């Protein structure tokens, strides 16, 4: 075990997954930002197969996968994976391929029925429309699997209406669109406490 | 659960010194927000020590202020009471507390109501 190293310590029941828009919207020292960010909220969870499982995803035109929930290793390990996750700076960041990935691999099967399910979608850029065919197939779906889909929208180029779309496929979707990847350490404590809220304690 | 058990009480001397201890243990257990308690024979509870989920944080009320020092161990998940400069109306039984609402939170809690989890309580007696 290893011990908090915050006050602020979320030990709920809850499966975790960050996905990362890989495209060039964000530089390569904007998407350091947006690393730190993740890895500054997984600080403050009680990471463990047990409490919070966490799964760190970047996506372009596909998925790179860097952390799955059920990667039994220490938080200080996840963290050092998250914190090296490697700069794509894709032309193309498509959420629809990356939601389906999130409804199809990672929640293929849902170990953890007592757990919240959450998504992450840090999302900075609009993908074409050629590739959003079956987008709201995918919100769908996880939404049948109670799997919460939180966008964060992060700069001017965040796909706004897509963002739209995921708030009213239900009601549990709550979206925060931001100016940029600096507003991400202020608003990360709004962000991780209302992720914990979400969670059962039991 | 969450389980605590004190060790350390004892019948000292004015001036004496204690180091109270208290061991956490049970799967819910989240480096919580600890506290000490003391009640005097027949009298109430009172919160005579306070800190935070790191430790970074303390509260003593203005009449233990100086004297008493709440410390923790996460990596033993322990909790220390210690007592300085003993003074006959220390003479009490002391508790070792838990808070368990909003644990998450892991700020310094001052209210009685915000601890859940409780030991049985070790002797302090200070006599001349």
Same mark, same amino acid.
């Given at each position: 075990?290893?011990?908090?190293?915050?006050?602020?310590?979320?030990?709920?029941?809850?499966?975790?997954?960050?996905?990362?828009?890989?495209?060039?919207?964000?530089?390569?020292?904007?998407?350091?930002?947006?690393?730190?960010?993740?890895?500054?909220?997984?600080? &403050?969870?009680?990471?463990?197969? /047990?409490?919070?499982? +966490?799964? #760190?995803?970047?996506?372009?035109? !596909?998925? %790179? @996968?860097?952390?799955?929930?059920?990667?039994?290793?220490?938080?200080?390990?996840?963290?050092?994976?998250?914190?090296?996750?490697?700069?794509?700076?894709?032309?193309?960041?498509?959420?629809?391929?990356?939601?389906?990935?999130?409804?199809?691999?990672?929640?293929?099967?849902?170990?953890?029925?007592?757990?919240?399910?959450?998504?992450?979608?840090?999302?900075?850029?609009?993908?074409?429309?050629?590739?959003?065919?079956?987008?709201? &197939?995918?919100?769908?779906?996880? /939404?049948?699997?109670? +799997?919460? #889909?939180?966008?964060?929208?992060? !700069?001017? %180029? @965040?796909?706004?209406?897509?963002?739209?779309?995921?708030?009213?496929?239900?009601?549990?979707?709550?979206?925060?669109?931001?100016?940029?990847?600096?507003?991400?350490?202020?608003?990360?404590?709004?962000?991780?406490?209302?992720?914990?809220?979400?969670?059962?304690?039991? | 659960?969450?389980?605590?058990?004190?060790?350390?009480?004892?019948?000292?001397?004015?001036?004496?010194?204690?180091?109270?201890?208290?061991?956490?243990?049970?799967?819910?257990?989240?480096?919580?927000?600890?506290?000490?308690?003391?009640?005097?024979?027949?009298?109430?509870?009172?919160?005579?020590?306070?800190?935070?989920?790191?430790?970074?944080?303390?509260?003593?009320?203005?009449?233990?202020?100086?004297?008493?020092?709440?410390?923790?161990?996460?990596?033993?998940?322990?909790?220390?009471?210690?007592?300085?400069?003993?003074?006959?109306?220390?003479?009490?039984?002391?508790?070792?507390?838990?808070?368990?609402?909003?644990?998450?939170?892991?700020?310094?809690?001052?209210?009685?109501?915000?601890?859940?989890?409780?030991?049985?309580?070790?002797?302090?007696?200070?006599?001349?």
């Amino acid at each position: 075990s290893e011990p908090p190293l915050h006050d602020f310590y979320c030990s709920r029941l809850l499966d975790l997954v960050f996905l990362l828009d890989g495209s060039s919207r964000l530089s390569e020292a904007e998407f350091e930002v947006l690393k730190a960010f993740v890895v500054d909220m997984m600080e &403050r969870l009680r990471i463990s197969q /047990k409490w919070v499982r +966490v799964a #760190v995803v970047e996506y372009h035109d !596909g998925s %790179h @996968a860097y952390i799955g929930l059920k990667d039994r290793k220490r938080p200080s390990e996840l963290r050092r994976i998250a914190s090296q996750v490697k700069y794509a700076g894709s032309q193309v960041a498509s959420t629809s391929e990356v939601l389906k990935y999130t409804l199809f691999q990672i929640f293929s099967k849902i170990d953890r029925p007592e757990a919240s399910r959450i998504t992450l979608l840090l999302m900075a850029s609009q993908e074409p429309q050629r590739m959003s065919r079956n987008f709201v &197939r995918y919100v769908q779906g996880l /939404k049948k699997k109670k +799997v919460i #889909v939180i966008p964060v929208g992060i !700069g001017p %180029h @965040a796909n706004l209406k897509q963002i739209r779309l995921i708030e009213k496929q239900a009601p549990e979707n709550k979206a925060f669109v931001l100016s940029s990847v600096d507003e991400l350490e202020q608003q990360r404590d709004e962000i991780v406490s209302y992720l914990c809220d979400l969670a059962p304690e039991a | 659960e969450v389980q605590l058990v004190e060790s350390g009480g004892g019948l000292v001397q004015p001036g004496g010194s204690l180091r109270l201890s208290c061991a956490a243990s049970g799967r819910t257990f989240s480096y919580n927000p600890m506290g000490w308690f003391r009640q005097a024979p027949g009298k109430g509870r009172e919160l005579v020590a306070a800190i935070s989920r790191t430790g970074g944080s303390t509260y003593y009320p203005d009449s233990v202020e100086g004297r008493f020092t709440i410390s923790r161990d996460n990596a033993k998940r322990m909790v220390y009471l210690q007592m300085n400069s003993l003074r006959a109306e220390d003479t009490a039984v002391y508790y070792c507390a838990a808070a368990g609402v909003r644990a998450e939170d892991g700020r310094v809690r001052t209210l009685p109501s915000e601890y859940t989890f409780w030991g049985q309580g070790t002797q302090v007696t200070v006599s001349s």
